[PDB]
Amino acid sequence: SMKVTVVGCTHAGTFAIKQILAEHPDAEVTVYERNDVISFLSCGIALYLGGKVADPQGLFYSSPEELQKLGANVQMNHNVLAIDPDQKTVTVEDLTNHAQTTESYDKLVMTSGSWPIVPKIPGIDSDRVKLCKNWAHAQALIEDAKEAKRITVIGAGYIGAELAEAYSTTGHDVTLIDAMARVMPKYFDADFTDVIEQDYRDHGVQLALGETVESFTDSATGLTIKTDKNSYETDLAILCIGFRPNTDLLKGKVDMAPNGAIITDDYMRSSNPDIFAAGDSAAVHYNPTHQNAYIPLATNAVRQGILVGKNLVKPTVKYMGTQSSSGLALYDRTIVSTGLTLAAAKQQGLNAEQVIVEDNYRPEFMPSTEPVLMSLVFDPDTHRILGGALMSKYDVSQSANTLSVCIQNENTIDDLAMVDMLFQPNFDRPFNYLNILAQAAQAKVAQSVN
Amino acid sequence: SMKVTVVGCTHAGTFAIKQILAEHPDAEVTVYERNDVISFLSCGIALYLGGKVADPQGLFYSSPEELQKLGANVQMNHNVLAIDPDQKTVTVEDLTNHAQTTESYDKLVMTSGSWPIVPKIPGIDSDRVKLCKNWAHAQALIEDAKEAKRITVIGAGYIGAELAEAYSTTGHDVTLIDAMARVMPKYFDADFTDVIEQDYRDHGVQLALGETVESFTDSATGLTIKTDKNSYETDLAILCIGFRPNTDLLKGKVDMAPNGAIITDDYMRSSNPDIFAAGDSAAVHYNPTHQNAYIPLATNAVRQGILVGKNLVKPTVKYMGTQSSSGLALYDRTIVSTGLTLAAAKQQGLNAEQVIVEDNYRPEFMPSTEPVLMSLVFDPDTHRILGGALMSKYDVSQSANTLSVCIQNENTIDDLAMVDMLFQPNFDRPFNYLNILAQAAQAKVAQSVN
Ligand SMILES: Cc1cc2nc3c(=O)[nH]c(=O)nc-3n(C[C@H](O)[C@H](O)[C@H](O)COP(=O)(O)OP(=O)(O)OC[C@H]3O[C@@H](n4cnc5c(N)ncnc54)[C@H](O)[C@@H]3O)c2cc1C
Ligand SMILES: Cc1cc2nc3c(=O)[nH]c(=O)nc-3n(C[C@H](O)[C@H](O)[C@H](O)COP(=O)(O)OP(=O)(O)OC[C@H]3O[C@@H](n4cnc5c(N)ncnc54)[C@H](O)[C@@H]3O)c2cc1C
């Protein structure tokens, strides 16, 4: 029977194994995972530290026992040491006793995920510097936070943004450091990040943007972080400066993006047709640019993992690409986005323009309403929508998914300006705020012809 | 100068006039309207009677003074008595002094809307039987509600359902009478309306479904309503049994649906190329069936009004059709839908199947979560989505707009099962509930092929 080896099992491996067992019940599925746990939702780390999680056992949706019950050979606490594609073998180490074995496979599923970026900064190995990815990192931060009054987050991505907000609302002195000029520049344009950065300042968070960390120096009174512009002392530092594909097992053996992300076809097959990749270990087709990108999100992991099971024997279901749709909740604001920002679109030489619209999402005669700040990025010549974002105290998260479907179908600002959307004052004005947003883009395009 | 006559001005006429004046500033636009007010939002009637509207003056978004300021010859309190499309002339009556005039036009915009259906039932002319459409009807119900403990709603569509809910939550004894079997069967299937009808019973509303009103008889202690199965005494009866296109001015002169709705091309031109129709006076292109239908919603009126302005001279912007996307709030429940129900699809002999899913909309480890009941109607052959509905105490209204864009682009259950949507525990599971909905539809299709 067909032998399948799965390297790594958090989200992409979990969905791949379940899919393979469901559609090929005769296949021999062996899975190796360094940790003793699977299906951990890292998105809940900041939610717990922020107080919002009572039972940490709810942060798991699967288990090694469940995959075993489904018919999988589950080998937890195993570290894959080598992958031999020409001999189609794999060498694995049992971390409980160093026992090494060499096994054959017919298909290999590379779901080894990613690992945080740790730069060559002097003193970064300090015990007051912590990572924040897996369940082990979470349990450490859970116990270490009660004593760390001063928290410093290094890296102003969405993960770093969530940690700073979660620690600020729980009685900590928070400093947010990043070398980039703005917070979360991949998701939102300057109009959005200006409001968010003001929210951090209003809540006492010290913003140290545009500064590069140079050294970590430990003393009795805490950890001293020196940047090219200032110096800070903290009780704990957390690294949130991005992720790197954990694919060195296949380096030089399958085609890769410069950062190590495995390049796949539309059926999740690598350059080696017997090695599949899914999740943080792989690149994704970015629909707005029709090129590969590294977008390490759980949405890609669960989707690509399913496709691995669909296409294990032969191509069956094509990958639909992604728009990198994301959403965040910070200081009672819902901040969502999808596709390209204006900055990213121009940074990549695309013909793009932007409209910014602020409106109450539902009529004022209602008992309450709330302003929603909206952005729409579009090609001024083809009118094709390239991206969009919404920010409001009202939960506007589902509108980003509406925009994602628009971009998936390559709809224009003219499609969105008039497409049928419901009206009821409990929810919106006669035209939905997404219609109003696209009508503003039309007016900006019209203001150009005349 | 091009002379334009607009017959009727609530929503479709308001948007048409503003659009015509903006894109043809040198048009002579003359508008006649029986009422002395424009742009009244009839959806606010039930919202006020439910205590959700402090100032009823805010239920307007434009005014005759505004249209005149924009350049239009605004003739309020005028009743158009005749239209001659051959000679391109109109005959109007000034309702303030009975004065009649006769004017010519180059183009005529027929935005005469609709009027409630009044059946030939004995006693229905009683002063205790009230209509519920325009601002004059609203003021009467606002003043009568104080003296009407017992309210009887006739017609269990969305309008009557909202009135019954509004009165019942404000201390009124409510009876909901209708001859059809379910409430709002044009929007929702039985799984949804069973829960809705149960909410009415839990809140003390007397559901008189499957009953046919036979007479209204005034008595000493109010109004006696006799049906074929029961007898009711009430203080106020409100007719909510549907709407008829108010188009008798053009009967036999332009092509019409059997109910009188004016049939237009994709540019809102009637069979007479110089007469446009928009709003409740017209039939709409229904995308799920690709046929003309009568769907009197404010969403269609504001859209088709805009298209009249853009297509006044020559065809410029095509009509995108509609999905009849709608949404309501009944007893803290957000209930939204778009496209075909399974009942309506089978009633028209369409190859259609349905899947029903109930799930918590976001993970259980969050501080709170809420169940959402979901429906997806699809063609089991082509996999094309025909319609969908969602119901939850959490505001899921935006998801119906996502399904509308899906139907607009003729996406399949396979497209929706895997299309990129954001994940963050504040909003959804790793797969958005819309993804999960379409994945269950794939499962139903899969269990039939094997
Ligand atoms: C704090 C945090 C918050 C996040 N929030 C969100 C969010 O809100 N929304 C969203 O969409 N995404 C979010 N993400 C990203 C999301 O968690 C990742 O995309 C997801 O973990 C990727 O799934 P994966 O299984 O492909 O990768 P991984 O989770 O990294 O799984 C890889 C596994 O492979 C194992 N492994 C690696 N090498 C070997 C080897 N030689 N032998 C054996 N095992 C090996 C590793 O032990 C690891 O467990 C967040 C991430 C973090 C860190
Ligand atoms: C209680 C109620 C609640 C509703 N709730 C919603 C909702 O929540 N969401 C939604 O999308 N839709 C809703 N609707 C429907 C929506 O209000 C209508 O579709 C909308 O009014 C249609 O706009 P219209 O201008 O085309 O038609 P109309 O509102 O009927 O306007 C027609 C105008 O033309 C005038 N007129 C007619 N004949 C003549 C004549 N010979 N001479 C001069 N003037 C004339 C009339 O006086 C009238 O003012 C609701 C309707 C009602 C009645």
Summarize the structure.
Chains A, B: Its cofactor is FAD. By secondary structure, the first copy, chain A, is α/β, with parallel strands linked by helices. The first copy, chain A, is 25% helix and 28% strand.
What features would you describe in this structure?
The structure is a homodimer of 450-residue chains. Chain A has 450 residues and is α/β, with parallel strands linked by helices. Chain A folds into three domains: 1-34 and 61-113 and 245-325, 3-Layer(bba) Sandwich (FAD/NAD(P)-binding domain), CATH 3.50.50; 42-59 and 114-243, 3-Layer(bba) Sandwich (FAD/NAD(P)-binding domain); 333-445, 2-Layer Sandwich (Enolase-like, domain 1), CATH 3.30.390. Chain A has eleven helices and 25 strands. In chain A, the strands form seven sheets. Chain A has a five-stranded parallel sheet. A five-stranded parallel sheet of chain A has the order 9-16-10-11-12, with helices on one face. In chain A, helix 1 (12-23) runs parallel beside helix 7. The longest helix of chain A has 17 residues, at 433-449. The radius of gyration of chain A is 23 Å and the shape is globular. The N and C termini of chain A lie far apart (69 Å). Chains A and B meet through helix 7, strand 21, strand 22, helix 9 and helix 10 of A and helix 7, strand 21, strand 22, helix 9 and helix 10 of B. The complex binds flavin-adenine dinucleotide (FAD) (2 copies). One flavin-adenine dinucleotide is lined by residues 7-8, 10-13, 32-35, 42-43, 45, 78-80, 111-114, 132-133, 159, 246, 249, 279-280, 296-299, 301 of chain A. One flavin-adenine dinucleotide binds at residues 7-8, 10-13, 32-35, 42-43, 45, 79-80, 111-114, 132-133, 159, 246, 249, 279-280, 296-299, 301 of chain B. Chains A, B: NADPH 2 binds at residues 156, 158-159, 187, 242, 327.
